[PDB]
Design a protein. Structure first.
Lengths: 589, 589
């Protein structure tokens, strides 16, 4: 009852994790990124009140902790042609999500031009967000801080020239997972050919904590003891994440690089319960059952549940109640929650959970769940089809022979629920050539907006070659050529082996030379007109025929356009996204 | 490329229009509901600055006008079991939309029970909203004003026990029209069996005007001269509106009352333009063409365009540019904008435009467009397929013999666009019985939460019988019986003709008597247990067989359950929705 949606682009920043590499390593190490509220956010002087009961009175907060995001206020405005003044006025949540949105494009190997020519720019944007408070800031001269849920999505669609549906998704705690679901639906029904979905969550004003405290939803100890004993409330967590989605059918045909596959998803509402924020286990069951059927998968086909897992006394047993009811017709299924690592990201909780699930699928490992040494007294997993993953362990292939599958749940405080089933992506791969692939010379073009960015890009690729990620030069070359935009500061390499390229990159970073360097400050139209000169056309044709790759490389580095299809199309691969290192835009505490 | 979605429920409140009857009469009369900012909103002392240039400096507003909504802060909290304290803290936008959401249910003739039994409560909620500012208020003791886009939808899903998708829609100026589109999509794809979609727009804080002024988007004269000469900016307008939607296939089968049919709709984004808020005529063309094709209708099949029509110098010609490009392959098509009547409702602009379009379709008339005596100099409609409807005129059936169709456009400031094509609903109706329908006695049950509400309900029905709306008693009876919830204060009539019923209602409002009055303060379960007594069952059966209708009426009025199917199912009709007259919840200026 559903068509598979390929996940071809993935980006994210999380507490103590500027990259997904760091994020996975933290998860693998069972790291908790809890921290007292940074001085730059707001002073704890008239904010923190140790006693929970006295805190609700006089409008304070009994929580001083939180998992915060580094460089939350940092934004490369110049990159997006945004004036410093305007950037200062837009919510940091929106700034971070723009960079994230660019990053998923690069990760997937899509340029703005390729989106236009190949998909008519029909790319939808569904951006999860629920947190406000940036409005409350009143900075000195006139500055006008503003949060626009619409702008979050629409500005992305603007800057990237996307013509698909563009809207925020605010279902509170389940926003980003609702967004990921809606994106999939629009793709299954042809509303758009690609879709960016994600979420962002920042705590910019102390009033956020005060409000969360008034409802007694924050943990008094500052932890998310998901399904652990002494479950109080949750720990506020920050983060940005996005995915680029496309129907598996189209992705495989277009040779897109595929992280994983969303095989089924669902959303609903709990309806009338005893209270406005009282969860409905019956609804959660129907929710997950719905997703299961659309994926055409029995509950016994799920290897891991990334649970909502807020870490509250009555909340966690309800979630397991709903899970048991859903898995009842179809035990020991691995269960945990990223909340125990980085807290509650609310709007960004879904994308964070999904990201962890994908990383688990890809690495074939279970990340431990923290604060579960003593399981919540009101739950015994022995009577459930589930088993709390307190420790790290390998994720073996199912006995079926099928794919690994994970279920991710996200439950909104207002009763809006979401569930996404994600499967490992497997495909027939031919045996490797022995003892190595063919050593043919390829052009490896590299560009960035500034020299500092250029060196950062090269640094990223050096780390890529060294950190054991599967690398075949021609695929990397093709992605650099057709999956990256041509920018002003350029360097182009010619190499036949990764070893040779790594040697070159090392030399370049430390600085005749084994590369062509160039600065191209010219319109595409001007450079095109030059390239159309007959003798210049003749030069390129000659160089290609005689295999003068270093001349072609020099030509490109100086600004000349090359028809890359003439130089051989291998499938594209995931290469490091733009190393944003923008300015800081923050009013202050 | 689309399935028809029936519009079976319609509700709305607009400036100088507490009911849609008043709204249509205002539109018919060419009335403008412009007004200076009410004292209860905010003082104009440190707010209004006559000079536009000096106003942007020192953070003021050069607009003092606006189309405002009566009883914006009024809310029947008791009706929804909401404590006065909590109601005070929720955004008036959310309060008004709850009442609206209940009203569309009653208009469509749906109870909460019928939704559950017949559709498993799979009703989606898509609520348009973009305006914030309620947060800015800091009332005395602790009160905490809050705007939650998620709650807007989720609270409705809660109170009404709905289990479908529940989310706000914020695409800025096009919110409600985006919401109506998304609702339709979810219905076409089986995401839910019914859907509530709508929008709300209030100006609760003066900062709203200040921000709109900074971008020079407000009119200096306080008018929406849509496609008229001297087009400045727009006039801020308030309003609440909602629709209840269901696939035409299901609606006709279930005998639902049908206002009109949404035959096609579309959304997109302008992409990269010269500025973030600079409209894309090319995108608007593709948008409308998209909707046209999904409806399977040529542009020559459209009788009226309800244009976005902000009333700006360069904005209006762009809209017509996009309209001409769209209508180019497939002149004099009627065109206008409700903006000229009630200003710019932004989030609620779409639903307001749609509502006007439906009222035009139903009455078969064109409402005039105001401030168009001098057409915008940069446009001549003579070269366009369109003609600006400056005056009121009948809307004749198309020469094709087909249905009347209207196109409604709504363009967001962030570049998110929406277009909905709406068609007249026509169906084979048998010739009326002469000289009158059969005069058989029917039970006409009436109930409300209080006596004041009960008398208000009866007043509504009296007006209904007198104002020439088509009335056949058995249909009205059936809707009162199965399309209204049974509440505490009850009165039940037995009548055979509308004349007789009207006589009774008149007597009742002025007060043996020709009705049974009752107050039922009891659980359904308690009353059910009584009704199950054998001799009581026997009584009802006897009464039905002997046709003792006044005894049955007395029985129901005293709290006894009647199986209404035993008393005859005619199709339901639109009866007046609950006459909400709640308390006022407003912090102050
Ligand atoms: Cl350099
Ligand atoms: Cl009375």
């Amino acid at each position: 009852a559903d068509e598979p949606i390929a996940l071809i682009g993935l980006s994210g920043r999380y507490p103590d994790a500027p990259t997904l590499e760091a994020f996975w390593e933290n998860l693998r190490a069972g790291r908790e990124s809890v921290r007292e509220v940074p001085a730059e956010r707001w002073p704890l002087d008239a904010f923190y009140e140790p006693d929970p009961q006295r805190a609700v009175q006089q409008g304070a907060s009994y929580s001083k902790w939180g998992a915060f995001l580094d460089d939350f206020a940092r934004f490369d405005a110049a990159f997006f042609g945004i004036a410093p003044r305007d950037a200062a006025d837009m919510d940091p949540q929106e700034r971070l999500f723009v960079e994230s949105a660019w990053s998923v494009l690069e990760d997937a190997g899509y340029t703005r031009q390729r989106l236009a020519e190949q998909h008519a720019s029909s790319v939808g944007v569904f951006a999860g967000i629920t947190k406000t408070g940036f409005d409350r800031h009143r900075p000195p001269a006139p500055p006008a801080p503003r949060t626009s849920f619409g702008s979050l999505a629409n500005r992305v669609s603007y800057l990237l020239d996307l013509h698909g549906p563009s809207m925020p998704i605010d279902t509170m705690c389940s926003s980003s997972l609702t967004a990921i679901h809606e994106a999939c639906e629009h793709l299954r029904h042809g509303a758009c050919e690609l879709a960016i979905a994600g979420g962002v969550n920042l705590y910019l004003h102390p009033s956020s904590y005060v409000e969360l405290c008034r409802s007694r939803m924050l943990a008094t100890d500052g932890h998310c003891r998901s399904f652990g004993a002494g479950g109080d409330g949750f720990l506020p967590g920050e983060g940005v994440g996005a995915v680029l989605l496309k129907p598996l059918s189209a992705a495989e045909a277009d040779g897109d690089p595929i992280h994983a596959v969303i095989v089924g998803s669902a959303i609903n509402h709990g309806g009338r319960t005893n209270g406005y924020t009282v969860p409905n286990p019956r609804a959660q069951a129907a929710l997950i059952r719905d997703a299961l059927d659309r994926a055409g998968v029995s509950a016994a086909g799920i290897g891991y549940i990334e649970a909502h897992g807020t870490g509250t006394r009555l909340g966690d047993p309800v979630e397991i109640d709903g899970l048991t009811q859903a898995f009842a017709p179809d035990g020991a299924c691995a269960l945990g929650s990223v909340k125990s690592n980085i807290g509650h990201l609310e709007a960004a909780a879904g994308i964070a959970g999904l990201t962890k699930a994908v990383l688990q699928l890809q690495h074939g490992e279970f990340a431990p769940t923290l604060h579960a040494e003593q399981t919540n007294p009101d739950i015994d997993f022995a009577a459930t089809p589930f088993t709390l993953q307190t420790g790290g362990a390998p994720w073996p292939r199912p006995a079926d022979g099928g794919p690994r599958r994970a279920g991710i749940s996200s439950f909104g405080a207002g009763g809006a629920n979401a569930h996404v089933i994600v499967a490992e992506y497997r495909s027939a791969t031919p045996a490797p050539a022995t003892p190595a692939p063919s050593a043919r010379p390829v052009l490896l073009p590299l560009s960035a907006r500034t020299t500092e960015d250029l060196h950062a890009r090269a640094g990223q690729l050096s780390d890529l070659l060294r950190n054991g990620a599967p690398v075949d030069l021609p695929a990397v070359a093709a992605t650099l050529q057709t999956g990256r935009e041509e920018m002003a500061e350029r360097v182009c390499f010619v190499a036949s082996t990764p070893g040779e390229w790594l040697d070159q990159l090392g030399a370049f970073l430390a600085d005749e030379v084994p590369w062509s360097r160039g600065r191209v400050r010219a319109t595409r139209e001007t450079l095109a007109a030059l390239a159309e000169k007959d003798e210049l056309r003749a030069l390129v044709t000659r160089w290609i025929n005689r295999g003068d790759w270093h001349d072609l490389a020099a030509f490109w580095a100086k600004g000349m356009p090359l028809d890359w299809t003439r130089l051989h199309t291998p499938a594209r691969v995931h290469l490091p996204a733009y190393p944003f290192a923008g300015r800081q835009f923050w009013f202050g505490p």
